[PDB]
Design a protein around this ligand. Structure first.
Ligand SMILES: CCc1nc(-c2cccc(C)c2)c(-c2ccnc(NC(=O)c3ccccc3)c2)s1
Length: 338
């Protein structure tokens, strides 16, 4: 049942992959490992193959490898990066040292389709719809992305979009204010804040909150969404955090209609619901998909949710060989998608 593997050196690393993956071509590398483009002769698909670096070097590396693999195996949605294949040239656990991950080759992210231009309202609808459809699924697995930005959104020529965690082979511009401040209780709508920032930028052709630094970022945010009202302040536990809010100059929320000039009034309404300062009042991914702005794309019967995602491993402190063994189990149990 094991396919025939072949060796090949690139960039200065011995790749050992099953024969089905042909014409390996390095696309990039980093501290995580290396990625090659390949042709999958089994499927006729152009795939990316990633060889992890130092997957089991330490307890932390091993747990990270297991984390990454477990998550990828669980993410099964059109708008979220998933797994076509996972393999190892190892024939046993004792042999097991390398992990390779396989996914659809992606050639572009949101930045390089947009090219910092105004997109049409129809195009924005389609892109934002997809992000939110992916987010609904992600959030239903009780996961928060936390790092949504244009570089974490892969987009093909047909503007079909997938959410990434790591980009292709600043961030503060899309971060929710509660993360910018050190408010130690955030919800999934931190990702909705990010989506609103992305949406605004797609519509306007300009970064919504291009802060120069941490402080500037919050200044820019608060100028638009206002300083915390009395309802929000009542939910802030630390005196000094409230002291920090009050010390800074008090400004009203701007009317987004007087900000996003010429935009579809439904786009403006949705942005208002995404960019509420109080995260308790921020629209969810599922509620946003039902918003009238998405009427041409919304299908309540094809916006699926994820299976329950068991994240209990996160609280465990195990030895390297235990994490390695658990990862090995996940490699061998992988069933390709249909
Ligand atoms: C930075 C860490 C990365 N990991 C992957 C990856 C590869 C295989 C499997 C999985 C789960 C992730 C990446 C990936 C996935 C799919 N496509 C790409 N493609 C590219 O990076 C790319 C860039 C320019 C031109 C052509 C291709 C990268 S990037």
């Amino acid at each position: 049942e094991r396919p025939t593997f072949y060796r090949q050196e690139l960039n200065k690393t011995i790749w050992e992959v099953p024969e089905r993956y042909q014409n390996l071509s390095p696309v990039g590398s980093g501290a995580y490992g290396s990625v090659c483009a390949a042709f999958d002769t089994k499927t006729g698909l152009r795939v990316a193959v990633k060889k992890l670096s130092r997957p089991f070097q330490s307890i932390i590396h091993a747990k990270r490898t297991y984390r990454e693999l477990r998550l990828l195996k669980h993410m099964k949605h059109e708008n979220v990066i998933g797994l076509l294949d996972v393999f190892t040239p190892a024939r046993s656990l004792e042999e097991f040292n390398d992990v390779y991950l396989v996914t659809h080759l992606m050639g572009a992210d949101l930045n390089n389709i947009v090219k910092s231009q105004k997109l049409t309202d129809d195009h924005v609808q389609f892109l934002i719809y997809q992000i939110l459809r992916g987010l609904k699924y992600i959030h239903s697995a009780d996961i928060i992305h936390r790092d949504l930005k244009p570089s974490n959104l892969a987009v093909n020529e047909d503007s079909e979009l997938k959410i990434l965690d790591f980009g292709l082979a600043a961030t503060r511009w899309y971060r929710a204010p509660e993360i910018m401040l050190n408010w130690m209780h955030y919800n999934q709508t931190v990702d909705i804040w990010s989506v609103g920032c992305i949406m605004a930028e797609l519509l306007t052709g300009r970064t919504l909150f291009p802060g120069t630094d941490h402080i500037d970022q919050l200044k820019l945010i608060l100028r638009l969404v206002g300083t915390p009202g009395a309802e929000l302040l009542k939910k802030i536990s630390s005196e000094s955090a409230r002291n920090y809010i009050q010390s800074l100059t008090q400004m009203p929320k701007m009317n987004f209609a007087n900000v996003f000039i010429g935009a579809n009034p439904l786009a403006v309404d949705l942005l208002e619901k995404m960019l509420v300062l109080d995260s308790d009042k921020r629209i969810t991914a599922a509620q946003a998909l039902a918003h009238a702005y998405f009427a041409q794309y919304h299908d309540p019967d094809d916006e699926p949710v994820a299976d329950p995602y068991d994240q209990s491993f996160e609280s465990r402190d195990l030895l390297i060989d235990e994490w390695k063994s658990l990862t090995y189990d996940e490699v061998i149990s992988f069933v390709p998608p249909p």
